[PDB]
Amino acid sequence: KKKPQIKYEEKQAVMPESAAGTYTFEVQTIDGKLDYEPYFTSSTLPWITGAPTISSRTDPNKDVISFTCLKNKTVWNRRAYIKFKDKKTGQYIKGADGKADLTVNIIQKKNENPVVHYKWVDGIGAPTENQKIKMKIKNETEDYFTDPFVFKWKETADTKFYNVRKLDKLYVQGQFPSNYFVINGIRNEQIQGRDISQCWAKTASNMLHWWFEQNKDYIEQYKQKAAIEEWKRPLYKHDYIRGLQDEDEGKKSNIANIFRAYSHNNARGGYIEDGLTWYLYKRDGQKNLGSIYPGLFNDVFAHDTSPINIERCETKKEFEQLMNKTLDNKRAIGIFWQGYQHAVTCWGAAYDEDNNIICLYIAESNLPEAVLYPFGVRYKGNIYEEAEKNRTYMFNYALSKPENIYIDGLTTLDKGEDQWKKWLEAHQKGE
Ligand SMILES: [K+]
Numbered sequence: 556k557k558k559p560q561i562k563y564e565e566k567q568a569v570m571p572e573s574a575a576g577t578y579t580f581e582v583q584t585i586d587g588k589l590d591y592e593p594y595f596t597s598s599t600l601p602w603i604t605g606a607p608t609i610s611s612r613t614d615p616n617k618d619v620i621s622f623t624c625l626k627n628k629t630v631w632n633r634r635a636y637i638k639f640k641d642k643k644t645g646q647y648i649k650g651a652d653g654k655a656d657l658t659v660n661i662i663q664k665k666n667e668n669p670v671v672h673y674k675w676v677d678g679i680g681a682p683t684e685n686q687k688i689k690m691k692i693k694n695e696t697e698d699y700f701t702d703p704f705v706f707k708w709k710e711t712a713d714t715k716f717y718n719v720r721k722l723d724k725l726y727v728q729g730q731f732p733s734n735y736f737v738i739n740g741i742r743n744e745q746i747q748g749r750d751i752s753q754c755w756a757k758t759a760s761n762m763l764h765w766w767f768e769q770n771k772d773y774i775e776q777y778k779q780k781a782a783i784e785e786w787k788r789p790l791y792k793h794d795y796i797r798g799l800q801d802e803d804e805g806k807k808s809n810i811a812n813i814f815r816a817y818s819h820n821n822a823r824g825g826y827i828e829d830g831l832t833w834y835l836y837k838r839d840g841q842k843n844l845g846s847i848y849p850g851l852f853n854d855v856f857a858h859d860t861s862p863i864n865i866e867r868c869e870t871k872k873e874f875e876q877l878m879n880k881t882l883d884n885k886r887a888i889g890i891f892w893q894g895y896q897h898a899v900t901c902w903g904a905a906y907d908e909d910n911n912i913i914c915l916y917i918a919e920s921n922l923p924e925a926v927l928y929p930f931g932v933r934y935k936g937n938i939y940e941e942a943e944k945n946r947t948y949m950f951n952y953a954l955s956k957p958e959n960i961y962i963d964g965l966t967t968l969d970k971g972e973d974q975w976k977k978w979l980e981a982h983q984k985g986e
């Protein structure tokens with residue numbers, strides 16, 4: 556009497572559709588019918604209902620194994636594993652090489668028709684359908700990314716986000732104006748500013764434009780009530796001119812021009828939070844960041860009352876908690892990572908029906924178009940039984956082979972409403 560065995564060609568994944576259902580695969584039964592029991596390697600996987608079972612043994616050559624899945628609402632494949640226990644010995648059955656356990660890889664396919672909702676940074680509106688631009692797949696082929704959340708948000712006269720671009724990247728030698736980089740400075744001096752490594756400053760400038768717009772009425776009062784230092788008076792405005800051609804980027808943003816003319820362009824880079832501090836209040840660390848120190852609202856804010864925060868994330872739970880808190884608190888968003896420290900601005904996020912964050916809409920100062928670009932959000936480990944670390948990779952749809960960008964954290968800028976309120980109540984009490 557030969558011992559019956561089971562076999563399965565492991566290179567064959569079992570791939571159920573995204574729909575809910577009971578799905579099957581076949582296990583070969585050799586020399587009879589082994590007494591075994593299938594088991595998922597994790598029993599707490601929420602999208603699998605119960606254990607797998609042997610649902611038919613009528614064919615002498617094969618067993619049918621069944622398992623039941625919930626609908627995959629997400630835009631990612633998801634993975635489970637089935638092993639088999641010999642019921643007499645209690646031991647896991649060996650695979651073809653005789654050493655590894657026999658393991659069947661289950662990969663339930665993604666939702667091809669997700670319902671997506673969006674959350675944008677407070678005060679910048681939301682894209683109209685006419686402002687959403689589909690994206691060609693690059694290798695530019697004539698294929699397009701076809702998932703609805705993959706769009707560029709085109710800047711127009713009517714859009715309210717900010718995306719200041721690096722003049723060093725836009726510049727075409729011999730075609731752009733020779734004076735493309737010239738800036739008229741605070742003392743009406745002419746300065747040539749370069750921005751090739753100023754990712755951090757472009758991100759700070761975008762956030763500062765948003766902050767000056769949000770706090771426009773407070774800043775008007777501040778200019779009328781504070782004893783402003785004479786040289787700083789021209790800095791209490793923000794001009795961001797939409798509709799300019801690339802050759803005119805030097806005229807587009809007074810804030811970006813201040814960083815370009817008076818900060819540094821060190822190839823190591825800088826930090827978003829340092830640019831934000833430098834613009835808004837005095838701190839000893841930023842003493843030598845530039846050749847001037849704007850510190851425009853030190854009467855309102857100090858480091859103790861700071862509207863700037865820095866937080867890190869290393870899991871899907873950490874990233875999503877941070878993003879949702881920031882978006883629900885009317886804060887602007889800078890994203891950083893070590894690549895030199897890289898920095899971009901985030902203006903919003905796309906969500907699937909499970910509230911997973913699936914895409915970010917990014918002002919990238921290194922990228923050429925006057926648009927926000929979609930950066931897809933992906934994970935390499937399980938998102939149901941999360942490991943100690945599950946980095947939130949970012950996928951640049953615009954690039955022809957997108958290297959993985961592990962988000963390190965978020966530098967955020969709050970409106971500072973309580974601080975502004977306390978400042979204003981203090982002046983009216985003295986009046
Ligand atoms: K689930």
Ligand SMILES: [K+]
Binds near residue numbers: 594595598605606607
């Ligand atoms: K099980």
Ligand SMILES: [K+]
Binds near residue numbers: 632633936937938939
């Ligand atoms: K998964």
